[PDB]
Amino acid sequence: ATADTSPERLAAIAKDALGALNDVILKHGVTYPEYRVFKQWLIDVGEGGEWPLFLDVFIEHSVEEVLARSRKGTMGSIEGPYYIENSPELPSKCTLPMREEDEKITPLVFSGQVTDLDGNGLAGAKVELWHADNDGYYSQFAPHLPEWNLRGTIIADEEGRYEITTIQPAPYQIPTDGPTGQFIEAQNGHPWRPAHLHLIVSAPGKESVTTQLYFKGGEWIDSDVASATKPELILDPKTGDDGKNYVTYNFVLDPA
Amino acid sequence: ATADTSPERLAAIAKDALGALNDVILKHGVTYPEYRVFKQWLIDVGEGGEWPLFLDVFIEHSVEEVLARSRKGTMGSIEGPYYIENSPELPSKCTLPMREEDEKITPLVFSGQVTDLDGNGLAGAKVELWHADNDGYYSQFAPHLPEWNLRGTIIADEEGRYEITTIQPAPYQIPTDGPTGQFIEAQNGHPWRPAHLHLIVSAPGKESVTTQLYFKGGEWIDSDVASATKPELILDPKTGDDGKNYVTYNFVLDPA
Ligand SMILES: [Cl-]
Ligand SMILES: [Cl-]
Ligand SMILES: [Cl-]
Ligand SMILES: [Cl-]
Ligand SMILES: [Cl-]
Ligand SMILES: [Cl-]
Ligand SMILES: [Fe+3]
Ligand SMILES: [Fe+3]
Ligand SMILES: [Mg+2]
Ligand SMILES: [Mg+2]
């Protein structure tokens, strides 16, 4: 990981970041016992391998909010910690890899088109999709799961269209066995995200968009622990007589 | 490490701490590349075992500033990361353990009395002292050094008086081989503390004081990387015809 940040820029960021934390300590009268706890908790986060989790839950949303200023296309959201590159490519109309267990869940049929800002459909567009199963697990983050379970890179058609069947996502509880759970527990917080799809949508000569999609009336939409839900990203799927949920959502890309 | 902090209190601290960092990201337009760097750097701090160093250098001073509000006695300062409990007890007039190498350095003869707020001398008072050698090393934090080099707990006399000989401390460069050094390097900062003694001064029925003492006209006093120097804690030792530096400093304790 590299960035082009100048010494001057880092100096300024570091000054107000530290200034800000030091201001919080002064405001609340943080005590030595509390300082000692905080020190050990930071150590524990690293030893538990939880930096990606903690940062993606409590910090990334502000980083996307910065990126969001520069963008006219479909709203972005956090990547979160569970993305895997090079998920196997699938045809424009497809179902994601899943287990026999997953086949017991109500299907979600997700259709739409990738377009530019004027509404023109894009060819060569890809839709990388990943999400949790009904048990609350991500493939590659649960040793029982086939490595691409509920993961794929969908090659859109010459018009930019896709029709992707998956399972209906359910709410996701973040790992609570470690320091991040402990941080949440200690303040009577809620360790839950709403049900969500993760997507990265790309196309030749376009700025990719990393986003998420949520479900109308879903649990936790108004109290997402990661602060990553946006009203523009809430889907309202319709149930057909086959008992499957159907929704269309188009992606709009900014130029690269 | 435990603290008595309520869920309500942690909730509030966490809210403005995170709010504050998120505000800094928004102010400066922190980018995804920069976020990725920050994530890896946090990981590196833990893997390098540098949480105590980083926090004591960049954060502890605000924690002492909180404690300072409650105190009328001699000014405190940060403990920093190098304190060791149960250093061997020494008589009221003593020299700290040192090596033949240390005996090559100009002596510092440090005298005074431990008193209450009215100026009354205290019996049963102890002065725990530790500091770096002229090479920039702390005992127990450098495998070549005898474990109590430049460390001792001085038992003051029935009047609270002490006369402690040590070596004249020299400026201290913080470890720069790791992520903390890298943080400093990346912003064209200075990885230096002024020359300093560390002391913890205690007595029956008194609140102990953890403090530091610095040296008039010393390098880095105005630009201490740890932000821990205070004008009240600057010593002005006088050189005698024996070529030794002499200084008196009295400690004043608040009641427990
Ligand atoms: Cl700073
Ligand atoms: Cl591609
Ligand atoms: Cl409805
Ligand atoms: Cl919060
Ligand atoms: Cl004692
Ligand atoms: Cl002078
Ligand atoms: Fe997720
Ligand atoms: Fe020191
Ligand atoms: Mg237009
Ligand atoms: Mg008085």
Coordinates of C-alpha atoms and ligand atoms in Angstrom, one line a residue:
Chain A
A1 CA 0.0 0.0 0.0
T2 CA 1.4 3.3 -1.2
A3 CA 0.0 6.9 -1.4
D4 CA 1.6 10.1 -2.9
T5 CA 1.0 12.2 0.2
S6 CA 3.5 14.9 0.8
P7 CA 5.3 15.5 4.2
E8 CA 3.4 18.8 4.5
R9 CA 0.0 17.0 4.0
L10 CA 0.8 14.2 6.5
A11 CA 2.0 16.8 9.0
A12 CA -1.3 18.6 8.8
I13 CA -3.5 15.4 8.9
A14 CA -1.4 14.1 11.9
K15 CA -1.7 17.4 13.7
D16 CA -5.5 17.6 13.6
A17 CA -6.0 13.8 14.1
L18 CA -3.9 13.8 17.2
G19 CA -5.2 17.3 18.3
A20 CA -8.7 15.9 18.0
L21 CA -8.0 12.8 20.1
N22 CA -6.2 14.8 22.7
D23 CA -9.2 17.2 22.7
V24 CA -11.5 14.3 23.4
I25 CA -9.4 13.2 26.3
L26 CA -9.5 16.7 27.7
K27 CA -13.3 17.1 27.2
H28 CA -14.2 13.9 28.9
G29 CA -11.4 13.8 31.5
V30 CA -10.1 10.4 30.4
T31 CA -8.3 8.9 33.3
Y32 CA -5.1 6.9 33.6
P33 CA -7.0 3.7 34.2
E34 CA -9.0 4.4 31.0
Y35 CA -5.7 5.1 29.1
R36 CA -4.3 1.8 30.2
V37 CA -7.4 0.0 29.0
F38 CA -7.3 1.8 25.7
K39 CA -3.6 0.8 25.2
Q40 CA -4.3 -2.8 25.9
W41 CA -7.3 -2.8 23.6
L42 CA -5.3 -1.3 20.7
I43 CA -2.8 -4.2 21.3
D44 CA -5.6 -6.7 21.3
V45 CA -7.1 -5.4 18.0
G46 CA -3.7 -6.1 16.3
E47 CA -3.2 -9.5 18.0
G48 CA -6.8 -10.4 17.0
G49 CA -6.1 -9.5 13.4
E50 CA -9.0 -7.1 13.6
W51 CA -7.6 -3.8 12.0
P52 CA -9.4 -4.3 8.7
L53 CA -12.7 -5.1 10.4
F54 CA -12.5 -2.3 12.9
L55 CA -11.4 0.3 10.4
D56 CA -13.9 -0.7 7.7
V57 CA -16.8 -0.6 10.2
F58 CA -15.9 2.6 12.0
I59 CA -13.8 4.7 9.6
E60 CA -14.2 3.7 5.9
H61 CA -17.6 5.4 5.5
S62 CA -15.9 8.8 5.9
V63 CA -13.3 7.8 3.2
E64 CA -16.1 6.9 0.8
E65 CA -18.0 10.1 1.7
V66 CA -14.8 11.9 0.5
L67 CA -14.8 9.9 -2.8
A68 CA -18.6 10.6 -3.1
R69 CA -18.0 14.3 -3.5
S70 CA -16.2 13.7 -6.8
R71 CA -18.9 11.5 -8.3
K72 CA -22.1 12.0 -10.3
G73 CA -22.9 8.3 -10.9
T74 CA -24.6 5.7 -8.7
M75 CA -23.9 6.2 -5.0
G76 CA -20.9 4.3 -3.6
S77 CA -20.6 2.6 -0.2
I78 CA -17.8 1.0 1.8
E79 CA -16.0 -2.0 0.4
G80 CA -15.8 -3.5 3.8
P81 CA -13.3 -6.3 4.6
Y82 CA -14.6 -9.2 2.6
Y83 CA -13.8 -8.4 -1.0
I84 CA -11.8 -11.0 -3.0
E85 CA -10.4 -10.1 -6.5
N86 CA -10.6 -12.4 -9.5
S87 CA -13.9 -14.2 -8.6
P88 CA -14.7 -16.4 -11.6
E89 CA -16.4 -14.7 -14.5
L90 CA -20.0 -15.6 -15.3
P91 CA -22.3 -14.9 -18.3
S92 CA -24.6 -11.9 -18.3
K93 CA -27.5 -14.0 -17.2
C94 CA -26.4 -16.4 -14.5
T95 CA -26.7 -17.7 -10.9
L96 CA -23.9 -17.2 -8.4
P97 CA -22.1 -20.3 -7.1
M98 CA -24.0 -21.7 -4.1
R99 CA -24.4 -24.8 -2.0
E100 CA -27.3 -27.1 -1.7
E101 CA -28.0 -25.4 1.6
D102 CA -28.2 -22.0 -0.1
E103 CA -30.7 -23.5 -2.6
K104 CA -33.2 -23.7 0.4
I105 CA -33.3 -19.9 0.5
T106 CA -35.7 -17.6 -1.4
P107 CA -34.0 -16.5 -4.6
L108 CA -33.2 -13.0 -5.5
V109 CA -33.2 -12.1 -9.2
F110 CA -31.2 -9.0 -9.8
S111 CA -31.5 -7.3 -13.3
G112 CA -30.4 -4.0 -14.8
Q113 CA -27.9 -2.2 -17.1
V114 CA -24.6 -0.5 -16.7
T115 CA -24.7 3.0 -18.3
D116 CA -22.8 6.2 -18.6
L117 CA -24.0 9.5 -17.1
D118 CA -26.3 10.2 -20.1
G119 CA -28.0 6.8 -19.7
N120 CA -26.1 5.1 -22.5
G121 CA -25.6 1.3 -22.0
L122 CA -21.9 0.1 -21.7
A123 CA -20.3 -2.9 -23.3
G124 CA -17.3 -4.6 -21.7
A125 CA -18.9 -3.9 -18.3
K126 CA -18.4 -6.2 -15.3
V127 CA -20.3 -6.6 -12.1
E128 CA -18.4 -8.2 -9.2
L129 CA -20.8 -9.4 -6.6
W130 CA -20.3 -10.9 -3.2
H131 CA -22.4 -11.2 -0.1
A132 CA -23.0 -13.3 3.0
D133 CA -25.1 -16.5 3.2
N134 CA -28.1 -17.0 5.4
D135 CA -25.9 -18.3 8.2
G136 CA -24.0 -15.0 8.3
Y137 CA -20.8 -16.2 6.6
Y138 CA -18.7 -15.0 3.7
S139 CA -16.8 -17.5 1.6
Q140 CA -13.0 -17.4 2.3
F141 CA -13.9 -16.2 5.8
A142 CA -15.4 -19.5 7.0
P143 CA -13.5 -22.7 6.5
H144 CA -16.7 -24.8 5.6
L145 CA -17.6 -22.8 2.5
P146 CA -16.5 -23.3 -1.1
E147 CA -14.2 -20.5 -1.9
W148 CA -16.4 -18.7 -4.4
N149 CA -19.7 -19.3 -2.6
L150 CA -21.9 -16.3 -3.4
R151 CA -19.1 -14.6 -5.4
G152 CA -18.8 -13.9 -9.1
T153 CA -17.7 -11.4 -11.8
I154 CA -20.7 -11.0 -14.1
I155 CA -19.8 -10.1 -17.7
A156 CA -22.6 -7.7 -18.8
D157 CA -23.9 -8.0 -22.4
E158 CA -23.2 -5.8 -25.4
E159 CA -25.9 -3.4 -24.0
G160 CA -24.5 -3.5 -20.5
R161 CA -27.3 -5.7 -19.2
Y162 CA -27.3 -8.5 -16.6
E163 CA -29.7 -10.8 -14.9
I164 CA -28.1 -12.3 -11.8
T165 CA -29.8 -14.9 -9.5
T166 CA -28.6 -15.3 -6.0
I167 CA -30.1 -15.8 -2.5
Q168 CA -31.9 -13.1 -0.6
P169 CA -29.3 -11.6 1.7
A170 CA -30.0 -11.6 5.5
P171 CA -28.8 -9.3 8.2
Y172 CA -25.0 -9.7 9.0
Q173 CA -23.6 -9.8 12.6
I174 CA -20.1 -8.7 12.7
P175 CA -17.6 -10.9 14.6
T176 CA -18.1 -10.3 18.2
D177 CA -15.6 -12.8 19.7
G178 CA -12.8 -10.1 19.7
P179 CA -11.8 -6.6 20.6
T180 CA -14.2 -5.0 18.1
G181 CA -17.2 -7.0 19.6
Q182 CA -15.9 -6.0 23.1
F183 CA -15.8 -2.3 22.1
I184 CA -19.4 -2.6 20.9
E185 CA -20.5 -4.7 24.0
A186 CA -18.9 -2.2 26.5
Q187 CA -21.0 0.7 25.2
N188 CA -24.3 -1.2 24.8
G189 CA -24.1 -0.9 21.0
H190 CA -25.5 -3.2 18.3
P191 CA -23.1 -5.4 16.3
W192 CA -25.3 -5.6 13.2
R193 CA -25.4 -4.6 9.6
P194 CA -28.5 -4.7 7.5
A195 CA -28.9 -7.4 4.8
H196 CA -26.7 -6.3 1.8
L197 CA -25.1 -7.1 -1.5
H198 CA -21.6 -5.9 -2.2
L199 CA -20.8 -4.8 -5.8
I200 CA -17.9 -3.4 -7.8
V201 CA -19.1 -2.2 -11.2
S202 CA -16.5 -1.4 -13.9
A203 CA -16.3 -0.7 -17.6
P204 CA -13.6 0.5 -20.2
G205 CA -12.9 4.2 -19.7
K206 CA -15.0 4.5 -16.6
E207 CA -14.3 5.1 -13.0
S208 CA -15.4 1.9 -11.2
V209 CA -17.9 2.1 -8.4
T210 CA -17.8 0.1 -5.2
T211 CA -21.2 0.0 -3.7
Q212 CA -23.8 -1.9 -1.6
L213 CA -27.5 -2.5 -1.9
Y214 CA -30.0 -3.0 0.9
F215 CA -33.6 -4.1 1.2
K216 CA -36.6 -2.0 2.0
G217 CA -37.9 -2.5 5.5
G218 CA -34.9 -4.6 6.4
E219 CA -33.8 -4.9 10.0
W220 CA -30.8 -2.5 10.9
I221 CA -31.1 -0.2 7.9
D222 CA -31.5 2.8 10.2
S223 CA -28.8 1.6 12.7
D224 CA -26.1 0.0 10.6
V225 CA -23.0 -0.4 12.8
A226 CA -20.8 0.5 9.9
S227 CA -22.7 3.7 9.1
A228 CA -22.7 2.7 5.4
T229 CA -26.4 2.6 4.4
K230 CA -27.7 5.3 2.1
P231 CA -31.4 5.8 1.1
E232 CA -30.4 5.7 -2.6
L233 CA -29.1 2.2 -2.3
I234 CA -32.3 0.6 -0.8
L235 CA -33.9 -2.0 -3.1
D236 CA -37.6 -2.8 -3.1
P237 CA -37.9 -6.3 -4.6
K238 CA -41.2 -7.7 -5.8
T239 CA -42.2 -11.3 -5.2
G240 CA -43.4 -13.2 -8.2
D241 CA -45.8 -16.2 -8.3
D242 CA -42.8 -18.4 -8.3
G243 CA -42.0 -17.0 -4.8
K244 CA -38.8 -15.4 -6.1
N245 CA -37.9 -11.8 -5.3
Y246 CA -37.2 -9.6 -8.4
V247 CA -35.6 -6.3 -8.6
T248 CA -34.0 -4.1 -11.2
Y249 CA -31.2 -1.6 -10.5
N250 CA -29.1 0.1 -13.1
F251 CA -25.5 1.3 -12.5
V252 CA -24.4 4.7 -13.8
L253 CA -20.6 5.2 -14.1
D254 CA -18.5 8.4 -14.1
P255 CA -15.7 8.6 -16.8
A256 CA -12.1 7.5 -15.9
Chain B
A1 CA -5.9 -3.2 32.9
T2 CA -9.4 -2.3 34.1
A3 CA -11.4 1.0 34.4
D4 CA -14.8 1.7 36.0
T5 CA -16.2 3.5 32.8
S6 CA -19.9 3.2 32.3
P7 CA -21.4 2.2 28.9
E8 CA -22.9 5.7 28.7
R9 CA -19.4 7.2 29.2
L10 CA -17.7 4.9 26.6
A11 CA -20.5 5.6 24.1
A12 CA -19.9 9.3 24.4
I13 CA -16.1 9.1 24.2
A14 CA -16.3 6.7 21.3
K15 CA -18.8 9.0 19.5
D16 CA -16.6 12.1 19.6
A17 CA -13.3 10.2 19.0
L18 CA -14.6 8.6 15.9
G19 CA -16.6 11.7 14.9
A20 CA -13.3 13.6 15.2
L21 CA -11.3 11.2 13.1
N22 CA -14.0 11.1 10.5
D23 CA -14.1 14.9 10.5
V24 CA -10.4 15.0 9.8
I25 CA -10.8 12.6 6.9
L26 CA -13.5 14.9 5.5
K27 CA -11.5 18.1 6.1
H28 CA -8.4 16.9 4.3
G29 CA -10.1 14.7 1.7
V30 CA -8.2 11.6 2.8
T31 CA -8.2 9.3 -0.2
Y32 CA -8.5 5.5 -0.6
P33 CA -4.8 5.1 -1.2
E34 CA -4.1 7.0 2.0
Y35 CA -6.7 4.9 3.9
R36 CA -5.0 1.7 2.7
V37 CA -1.6 3.1 3.9
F38 CA -3.1 4.0 7.3
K39 CA -4.6 0.5 7.7
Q40 CA -1.3 -1.2 7.0
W41 CA 0.6 1.3 9.3
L42 CA -1.8 0.4 12.2
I43 CA -1.1 -3.3 11.6
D44 CA 2.6 -2.6 11.5
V45 CA 2.5 -0.7 14.8
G46 CA 1.0 -3.7 16.6
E47 CA 3.4 -6.2 14.8
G48 CA 6.3 -4.0 15.8
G49 CA 5.2 -4.0 19.4
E50 CA 5.1 -0.2 19.3
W51 CA 1.7 0.6 20.9
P52 CA 3.2 1.7 24.2
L53 CA 5.8 3.9 22.5
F54 CA 3.4 5.5 20.0
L55 CA 0.7 6.2 22.6
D56 CA 3.1 7.5 25.3
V57 CA 4.7 9.8 22.8
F58 CA 1.7 11.1 21.0
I59 CA -1.3 10.7 23.5
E60 CA -0.2 10.3 27.1
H61 CA 0.6 14.1 27.6
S62 CA -3.2 14.8 27.3
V63 CA -4.0 12.2 29.9
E64 CA -1.5 13.8 32.3
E65 CA -2.9 17.2 31.5
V66 CA -6.3 15.8 32.7
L67 CA -4.7 14.5 35.9
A68 CA -2.9 17.9 36.3
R69 CA -6.2 19.7 36.7
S70 CA -6.8 17.9 40.0
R71 CA -3.4 18.6 41.5
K72 CA -1.9 21.5 43.5
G73 CA 1.6 19.8 44.1
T74 CA 4.6 19.6 41.9
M75 CA 3.8 19.4 38.2
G76 CA 3.5 15.9 36.7
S77 CA 4.6 14.7 33.3
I78 CA 4.1 11.5 31.3
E79 CA 5.4 8.2 32.6
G80 CA 6.5 7.2 29.1
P81 CA 7.1 3.6 28.3
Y82 CA 10.3 2.7 30.3
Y83 CA 9.2 2.6 33.9
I84 CA 10.0 -0.6 35.8
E85 CA 8.5 -1.3 39.3
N86 CA 10.4 -2.5 42.3
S87 CA 13.8 -1.1 41.4
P88 CA 16.1 -1.8 44.3
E89 CA 15.8 0.5 47.3
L90 CA 18.8 2.8 48.1
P91 CA 19.6 5.0 51.1
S92 CA 18.6 8.7 51.2
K93 CA 22.1 9.7 50.1
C94 CA 23.2 7.4 47.3
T95 CA 24.5 7.0 43.8
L96 CA 22.4 5.1 41.2
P97 CA 23.7 1.8 39.9
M98 CA 25.9 2.4 36.9
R99 CA 28.6 0.9 34.7
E100 CA 32.2 1.7 34.4
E101 CA 31.2 3.4 31.1
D102 CA 28.8 5.6 32.9
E103 CA 31.4 6.7 35.4
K104 CA 33.1 8.5 32.4
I105 CA 30.2 11.0 32.3
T106 CA 29.9 14.3 34.3
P107 CA 28.0 13.5 37.5
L108 CA 24.7 15.1 38.5
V109 CA 24.1 15.5 42.2
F110 CA 20.3 15.8 42.8
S111 CA 19.2 17.0 46.3
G112 CA 15.9 18.1 47.8
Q113 CA 13.0 17.3 50.1
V114 CA 9.6 15.6 49.7
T115 CA 6.9 17.8 51.4
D116 CA 3.2 18.3 51.7
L117 CA 1.4 21.3 50.3
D118 CA 2.3 23.5 53.3
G119 CA 5.9 22.8 52.9
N120 CA 6.2 20.2 55.7
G121 CA 8.8 17.5 55.1
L122 CA 7.5 13.9 54.8
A123 CA 9.0 10.7 56.3
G124 CA 8.5 7.3 54.6
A125 CA 8.8 9.1 51.2
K126 CA 10.4 7.3 48.3
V127 CA 11.8 8.6 45.0
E128 CA 11.8 6.2 42.1
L129 CA 14.3 7.4 39.5
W130 CA 15.1 6.1 36.1
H131 CA 16.6 7.6 33.0
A132 CA 18.7 6.9 29.8
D133 CA 22.4 6.5 29.7
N134 CA 24.6 8.7 27.5
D135 CA 24.3 6.2 24.6
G136 CA 20.5 6.7 24.6
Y137 CA 19.6 3.4 26.2
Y138 CA 17.3 2.4 29.1
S139 CA 18.1 -0.6 31.2
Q140 CA 15.8 -3.6 30.5
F141 CA 15.3 -2.0 27.0
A142 CA 18.8 -2.8 25.7
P143 CA 20.2 -6.4 26.2
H144 CA 23.8 -5.1 27.0
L145 CA 22.8 -3.2 30.1
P146 CA 22.6 -4.5 33.7
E147 CA 18.9 -4.6 34.6
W148 CA 18.9 -1.7 37.1
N149 CA 21.4 0.5 35.4
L150 CA 20.3 4.1 36.2
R151 CA 17.3 2.9 38.2
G152 CA 16.6 2.9 41.9
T153 CA 14.0 3.6 44.6
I154 CA 15.5 6.2 47.0
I155 CA 14.2 6.0 50.6
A156 CA 14.1 9.6 51.8
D157 CA 15.2 10.4 55.3
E158 CA 13.0 11.2 58.4
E159 CA 12.8 14.8 57.0
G160 CA 12.0 13.7 53.5
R161 CA 15.4 14.6 52.2
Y162 CA 17.6 12.9 49.6
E163 CA 20.9 13.4 47.8
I164 CA 21.1 11.3 44.7
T165 CA 24.1 11.1 42.4
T166 CA 23.7 9.9 38.9
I167 CA 25.0 10.9 35.4
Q168 CA 24.0 14.0 33.5
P169 CA 21.2 12.8 31.2
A170 CA 21.6 13.5 27.5
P171 CA 19.0 13.9 24.7
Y172 CA 17.0 10.8 23.9
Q173 CA 16.2 9.6 20.4
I174 CA 13.1 7.5 20.2
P175 CA 13.3 4.2 18.3
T176 CA 13.2 5.1 14.6
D177 CA 13.5 1.6 13.1
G178 CA 9.8 1.0 13.1
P179 CA 6.4 2.4 12.3
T180 CA 6.6 5.2 14.8
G181 CA 10.0 6.4 13.3
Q182 CA 8.3 6.0 9.9
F183 CA 5.4 8.2 10.9
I184 CA 7.9 10.9 12.1
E185 CA 10.1 10.5 9.0
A186 CA 7.2 10.7 6.5
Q187 CA 6.2 14.2 7.9
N188 CA 9.7 15.7 8.3
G189 CA 9.4 15.5 12.1
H190 CA 12.1 15.3 14.7
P191 CA 12.3 12.0 16.7
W192 CA 13.9 13.6 19.8
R193 CA 13.2 14.2 23.4
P194 CA 15.2 16.6 25.5
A195 CA 17.6 15.1 28.2
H196 CA 15.3 14.1 31.2
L197 CA 15.0 12.3 34.5
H198 CA 11.9 10.2 35.2
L199 CA 10.6 10.2 38.8
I200 CA 7.8 8.7 40.7
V201 CA 7.6 10.3 44.2
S202 CA 5.4 8.8 46.9
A203 CA 4.7 9.0 50.6
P204 CA 2.2 7.5 53.2
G205 CA -1.2 9.2 52.7
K206 CA -0.2 11.2 49.7
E207 CA -1.1 11.0 46.0
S208 CA 2.1 9.9 44.2
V209 CA 3.4 12.1 41.4
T210 CA 4.9 10.8 38.2
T211 CA 7.1 13.5 36.7
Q212 CA 10.1 14.4 34.7
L213 CA 12.9 17.0 35.0
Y214 CA 14.8 18.6 32.1
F215 CA 17.9 20.9 31.8
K216 CA 18.0 24.6 31.1
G217 CA 19.2 25.4 27.6
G218 CA 19.0 21.7 26.7
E219 CA 18.5 20.6 23.0
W220 CA 14.8 19.8 22.2
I221 CA 13.2 21.4 25.2
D222 CA 11.1 23.6 23.0
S223 CA 10.4 20.8 20.5
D224 CA 10.0 17.6 22.5
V225 CA 8.4 14.9 20.2
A226 CA 6.3 13.7 23.2
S227 CA 4.9 17.2 24.1
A228 CA 5.8 16.5 27.7
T229 CA 8.1 19.3 28.8
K230 CA 6.8 22.0 31.1
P231 CA 8.6 25.2 32.1
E232 CA 8.2 24.3 35.8
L233 CA 10.2 21.1 35.4
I234 CA 13.4 22.6 34.0
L235 CA 16.4 22.3 36.2
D236 CA 19.3 24.8 36.2
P237 CA 22.2 22.8 37.7
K238 CA 25.4 24.6 38.9
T239 CA 28.8 23.2 38.2
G240 CA 31.2 22.9 41.2
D241 CA 35.0 23.0 41.2
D242 CA 34.9 19.2 41.2
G243 CA 33.3 19.5 37.8
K244 CA 30.0 17.9 39.1
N245 CA 26.6 19.5 38.3
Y246 CA 24.5 20.2 41.5
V247 CA 20.8 20.9 41.6
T248 CA 18.1 21.0 44.2
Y249 CA 14.5 20.3 43.6
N250 CA 11.9 19.7 46.2
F251 CA 8.7 17.6 45.6
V252 CA 5.4 18.7 46.9
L253 CA 2.7 16.0 47.3
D254 CA -1.1 16.3 47.3
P255 CA -3.0 14.2 49.9
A256 CA -4.4 10.8 49.0
Ligands
CL1 CL 1.7 16.2 15.6
CL2 CL -11.9 -5.9 -16.1
CL3 CL -44.0 -2.0 -0.7
CL4 CL -19.9 5.6 17.5
CL5 CL 6.1 2.4 49.0
CL6 CL 22.5 30.3 33.9
FE7 FE -20.7 -7.1 4.0
FE8 FE 12.3 8.8 28.9
MG9 MG -26.3 15.7 -18.6
MG10 MG -2.2 26.9 51.9

